[PDB]
Amino acid sequence: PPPIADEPLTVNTGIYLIECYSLDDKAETFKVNAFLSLSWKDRRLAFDPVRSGVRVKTYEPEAIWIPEIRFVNVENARDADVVDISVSPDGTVQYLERFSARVLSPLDFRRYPFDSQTLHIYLIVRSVDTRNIVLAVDLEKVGKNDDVFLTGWDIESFTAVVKPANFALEDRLESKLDYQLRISRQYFSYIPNIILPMLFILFISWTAFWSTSYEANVTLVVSTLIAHIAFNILVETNLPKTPAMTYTGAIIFMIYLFYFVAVIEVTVQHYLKVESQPARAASITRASRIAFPVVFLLANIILAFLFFGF
Amino acid sequence: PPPIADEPLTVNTGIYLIECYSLDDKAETFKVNAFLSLSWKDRRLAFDPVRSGVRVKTYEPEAIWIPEIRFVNVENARDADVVDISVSPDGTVQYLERFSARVLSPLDFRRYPFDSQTLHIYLIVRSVDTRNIVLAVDLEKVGKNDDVFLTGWDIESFTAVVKPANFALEDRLESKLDYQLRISRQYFSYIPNIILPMLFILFISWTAFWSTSYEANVTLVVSTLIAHIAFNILVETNLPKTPAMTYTGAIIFMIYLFYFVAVIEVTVQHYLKVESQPARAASITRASRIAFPVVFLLANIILAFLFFGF
Amino acid sequence: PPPIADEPLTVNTGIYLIECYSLDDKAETFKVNAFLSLSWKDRRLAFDPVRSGVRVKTYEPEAIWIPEIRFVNVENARDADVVDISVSPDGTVQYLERFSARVLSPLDFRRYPFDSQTLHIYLIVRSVDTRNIVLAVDLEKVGKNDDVFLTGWDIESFTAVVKPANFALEDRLESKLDYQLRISRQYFSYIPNIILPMLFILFISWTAFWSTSYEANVTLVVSTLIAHIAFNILVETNLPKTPAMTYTGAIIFMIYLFYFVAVIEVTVQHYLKVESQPARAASITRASRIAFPVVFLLANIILAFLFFGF
Amino acid sequence: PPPIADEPLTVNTGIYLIECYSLDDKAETFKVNAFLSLSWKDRRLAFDPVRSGVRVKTYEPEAIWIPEIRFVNVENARDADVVDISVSPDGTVQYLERFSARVLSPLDFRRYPFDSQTLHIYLIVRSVDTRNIVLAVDLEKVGKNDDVFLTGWDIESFTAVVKPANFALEDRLESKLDYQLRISRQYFSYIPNIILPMLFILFISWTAFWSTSYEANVTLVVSTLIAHIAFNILVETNLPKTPAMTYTGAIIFMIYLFYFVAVIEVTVQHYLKVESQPARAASITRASRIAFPVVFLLANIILAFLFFGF
């Protein structure tokens, strides 16, 4: 029994995150636990304060027409839980439900660890006989409770883009709001825990340049390579999968490449030494001692700028 | 209380994916979140626009006969959620539910990474006293929302094969539509991340051909073999299980075989050198230096053609 | 309000697997998605075709007495979903529900990979005042849809043992049918993927018999042992846990035993060589070169016959 | 509407395990699938066999007063499913529900693998105006179906301690029965699969005592130590976590300690040999050859007795 008039029905909306949690990097989902606040005008149940004796009149949800607002990027039926429905005398209705749902928003991992994400929560409504359109009421959208937290993330801001998207969909108009939760990662624990030790085991690999012992060198470079793979396995949890070209993935690939050309160098130095041209051998090792750290430092700087300064 | 007439009842159907997600390579399932749109003629509730005063008359689902359309390859009861039921005056009924369900469709991994899949969603309906038959209405089947995504996949097309399958089943006719979601994988991140490093550790194993030191060689080939297994463990996540003969599984098996015959070679060179026939030894190593990369490049080319050009 | 007469009430039953899936080797469960078809005589609602005008009369499940058929080995409340209830005029009732449940049936892993399993689905019904007994109707038990699949398994047959088990249980008779889904494993992908590489790394271990260098030998045998454990970790996914004495577990244990006695041999050859009896040393190695592969081939043949030919 | 009389209301209880499954060593839970059988006297619905014409009168659960029996150590709302309620003429009521629930009972891992556990299922009931007390009826408690199984466990016995615990709780009497499922582990598969290979890799470590080559020895002892950690990783699944001092944890710790003092020994032998006192070196190695296996055998015997004979 929808409200009837000469104009499209506007439904004011607001979201208020009480809790947000479980940012699943793998499934690209995150659970949320919030207030939904709908408000719209329905003159059909507008009433008299004086004859009825009360400034505001509450109703059970079965009793009156409540618009079919629905989340779009939500993986399951939401845990709907009505908290209040109250009608002002002019027929404005104010509805407030608590809800929780796991939301599906894509994450972009290219600048990880130093990435930042912008999670989305969409809301559609579909038209009936009246055209129907949603819009944001900011006093009730200021959705962050002060206690909200994503462990490992700084929660920058919770806002909504005020202009609804409206479009044809299976021969009816539909209106869609985009709420946005913006976050940036807490990278620094990674420096002690991931980047420094990989660099250490890489440096141990470079020690072989001051050795001339081919068996000491192969044992050196290849055993460090095993250590490197083992350690990569150790931190495999903090290196989420993408089809995309990640930054960290880049520097890691580059490290495998350094293990490779170090093996090539050790082999060349041993071949030259075996062919009785010790001069070229020890010149190539003595040169490598500068070359490897430097080309690394350059390749890191290029690769850093290429992802961040671009 | 089914509609009654002289003809089999046709039910027009349409699906509209709002979101699809969670392509679980292991379980061969994928979750989907879509519109179902049923439409069929029921003259029994056909009505007069003029006496009733309205062009279209809505009904609650309890009120009227709605056909038992059911998914076939769905792992659980679907999260049904009716959005609209409306009746046109001639008695055509148009029904629209939102639903989400994890769908079970087999995946074929033989050409992985470069595979493509064609996920299915089946729809049966079972006959009552009237014969009952489903058919696709394309204006409401054009199921992709522009925002649909499977991370790591390009979503090619969403279509339905218009001819229903109809068949006897426990002494009743049944009608079955096959909707098809076609996808191809985003392989390229694999090149930096999986194939190149395996090839590097394999090349490091081939370095042993320029060495004559048996201890340097065993340490070389066997330590690279450990590194190889470690690395295979590292990417174990991106190498899904099959009973079938995979392409990537083929090249991997072939790599183990190369580690084996390299060990055989190193051993032969050392045995020959120990038996005072250094000429045959260093001839076999000097030969290996060409043979190994080449037979590899051939064996890869054969193996590639065998899976792709066949 | 149960049907009343002078005889035990027979309930005809049938199962029709639409889908089966998720054979969880760990939990020894497997999900199934099928038709249940109950049929039984109730003269109390037998009726007149002519006065009522219809050959068959449908009823909602609340309206009439439907026997409490229940699965036994099912881990949760089943997803019951009634599809049809129809009454023939003599009072025979034909009931058909779609259902899905994860079923608990033990698996026997002793001959794995080459095992075969026989999953079970039991059905009990408990007596009221009438004695109650189930029995199978084969036309509705032929439960395989042609599309049914367990990835990695050939689905041999779906049948039911026609004689019910009937027994006292807490002072009432109970009747129990046993449906049986028989399957055999798709082993062959394992040969390239598990058994050949383990054999290769074992052969690399045997290379040490042609070496006399004690450091080359320890590095050889012990580094292959690390590789072996690493590789076992790699395929740990395809080696399911049992309290029972597995065949594959046997050959694996035997491989560890071969690494051990190879270490013992290498040590003996080195001790003999150190005590100035080179003849006994090189005789023991030269002997080992035949002994190890042979005793292996024997021990595998015995072990194979012991599990399969017994 | 509770039964009223001059005495505390006794409720006879019985449990009948139809299936038990999913002994989760980690969560210390286990799922169970059984009969609950309640029986109690209610004269208010006692009735006349002759005027009513029937020996026993069934009732729907809504119709009459059924005591609030509740499980204590159960992690979720139980899957309640009433099977029968029947009233004898004197007013004794016999109630029988099927149920399944995952139960939380602590496990004691100190003697693992050879441990045995005693899982619990508690039942409380809370008093109303009548005092209320539970007690066990053994004919309906004999809860094992012959088919019950916990893979990897022998199921010793299912019994209940007949004396209820009764106590004040928030100003009301409460009665609590403790049913007990006793089990002992199937250890033997562990001998081939865990303990023997660890012992082998440890013995390989002791081989170094017959070597004087320091590089051979460090490669020996340290490479076996890597193998040991790898293998411990391989069986990490069968070594469940505790805050408590496990037996298997003890022997494992002791093994690490043996790797350590073997490294210390190899180092001392090399230091003595380097300081031109070969006599003390080879005396210490020759002594170690006996000492290590022996102190191990003693330390294992002490440790075994300390956990089992204590």
Next chain:
Amino acid sequence: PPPIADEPLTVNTGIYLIECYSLDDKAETFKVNAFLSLSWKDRRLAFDPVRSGVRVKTYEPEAIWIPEIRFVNVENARDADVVDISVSPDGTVQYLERFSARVLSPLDFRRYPFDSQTLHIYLIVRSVDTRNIVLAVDLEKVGKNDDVFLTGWDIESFTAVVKPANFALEDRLESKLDYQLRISRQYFSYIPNIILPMLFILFISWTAFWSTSYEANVTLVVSTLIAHIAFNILVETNLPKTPAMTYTGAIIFMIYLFYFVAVIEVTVQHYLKVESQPARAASITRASRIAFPVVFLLANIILAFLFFGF
């Protein structure tokens, strides 16, 4: 139909943990299974003991007004299960439900293993036309059953902070109680299982200081480094992820740093020895033998005090 009077409505509350379980270090959640006890005055259903004949009058939850108390930090709809509602003659109502819910409370890992946590359970209630305020009744808050246990934790105390938080929220007053479950970890099993073996493999690394053999030394230090990473992988389960600067993470990082500077030392000793200044080489090794254990002991002491004494 809320109670009406001149004062804000107080609702007395109490929680009684029957069981608590599943402390998930990763998700920072923990399941709980408890009593909720609400009590509040409603004169509208106050009644006469003498005319009605009973001291206390029970009601079904549908019958009367029960306040919307709701958990805040709970991840799903709670498994509500009403046990009793009883009304005293003056109109005080006493309500008691059993419930279970997984609770979301952050954990602080900085002092792990030796950490202690303080889990929270919040309770809000939102105002209607009457102002509404919660407060704790201690006789019914004493929530620990004697049997409660978190394996690996000592359960210190269960209490509630008696002063409610009250605040504006979307134009209504809200009241919020904070129950607190305090716990401290059972660390000691970690000493045999994690810290001692890491220290052992580190000491093995220090053995290299008494060796002058560069190949023995590289094999020593780098192979212990592989062992260290392997072992870290082995205990990866007991080292939970944080964005924060953990203590155990600190000592682990410091251990990687010791492997690094030990490699640097071994390299320096070999370079000095190669440049014909053996005096400086063996002086640096002989110095290292004291330096490494000492700086370690200091750095551990500083690090310990920095986390604990600060």
